[PDB]
């Protein structure tokens, strides 16, 4: 299959979290939320992530309650059955930008921006692909590449033609912690955030993994030594034959 169709293979960047002993960089996760809220959130939903899940991971109980209350959600109708709204609460899920699919495609040349809750896991490459796709938008398609109106070229996406334009540009976000919001510094962040969104069990999982592998390893070694001991009698056993008269 022609490489243009397979897509350019995403390179292996050094993620602070790649490693059996490594946790996510919650500092980066936090900045990630911001890059999402100011740039990505205008076209992408995060339907599977409930507000409360940020508490104790990237922000504080107050900070989340505050981000949540800025949105209205449907509440139980009043005395006479009149539908009324309500400010968001921790038990809620991050609201999407479009009320339905038809409306999402209307605002996107006919295309549909996938919900980014499991994007890192729904693609080969994961962090490396998401990150590479974000940063690798060449200012101009290679020679001979005729592009469909309203489309954009990006070598990493399969077929090279992608409906999403480029959105990350230097200094477009003002990082709270004073970090230079360069177009790549951001990509690194949102990606990390999107990774936690898809794999929240992360840190907790690798920790249990360490307990498990240690214990089972010991049980394995111990078991070999025990087996040999029990089998010793049979292993060393000797036979002598004397043909009966």
């Amino acid at each position: 299959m022609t490489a243009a169709e397979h897509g350019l293979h995403a390179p292996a960047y050094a993620w602070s979290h790649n490693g059996p002993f490594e946790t996510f960089d919650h500092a980066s996760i936090r900045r990630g939320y911001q890059v999402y809220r100011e740039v990505c959130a205008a076209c992408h939903s995060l339907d599977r992530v409930a507000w409360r899940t940020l508490v104790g991971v990237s922000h504080t109980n107050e900070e989340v309650r505050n981000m949540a209350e800025e949105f209205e959600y449907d509440d139980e109708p009043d005395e006479q059955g009149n539908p009324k709204k309500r400010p968001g609460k921790l038990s809620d899920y991050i609201p999407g930008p479009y009320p339905n699919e038809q409306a999402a495609r209307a605002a996107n040349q006919g295309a549909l921006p996938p919900d980014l809750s499991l994007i890192v896991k729904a693609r080969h490459g994961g962090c490396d692909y998401i990150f590479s796709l974000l940063t690798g938008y060449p200012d101009e398609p290679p020679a001979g590449v005729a592009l469909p109106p309203g489309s954009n070229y990006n070598p990493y996406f399969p077929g090279g033609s992608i409906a999403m334009a480029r959105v990350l540009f230097d200094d477009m976000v003002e990082y709270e912690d004073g970090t230079p919001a360069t177009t790549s510094q951001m990509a690194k962040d949102v990606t990390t955030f999107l990774n936690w969104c898809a794999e929240p069990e992360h840190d907790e999982r690798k920790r249990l993994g360490l307990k498990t592998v240690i214990i089972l390893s010991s049980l394995y070694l111990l078991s070999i030594w025990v087996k040999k001991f029990k089998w010793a009698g049979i292993k060393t056993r000797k036979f002598v034959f004397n043909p009966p008269k």
Binding site: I234, K235, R237, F239, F241, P243, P244
Partner: protein, 125 residues
Amino acid sequence: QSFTSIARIGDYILKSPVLSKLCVPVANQFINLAGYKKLGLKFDDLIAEENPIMQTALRRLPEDESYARAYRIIRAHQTELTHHLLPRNEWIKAQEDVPYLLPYILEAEAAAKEKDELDNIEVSK
């Protein structure tokens, strides 16, 4: 497959000096490559015994060849379970690797063949 069959094909080869000079070497090498002699076993000890014919044979085997065979088999299992090979001098030397059970097998086979034939013999008036 029957030994009456194996012994048929085999002898024919063993008789015509053309096939003989060409196959016997391959066969000798095939056998030394098999590795059973290295476990103190004769080929006949390898014959799968879970059938009437073999069962018939083994019973008809003279007491001494039987006790001997018994030992050889046990020895094989002990060695195999220890993952070693018997000390080189205990290996069955090709001259000992005799088809001791075979005659009994063939006898039993043909005996069965007949019983089988006489059970379905047609009549012609």
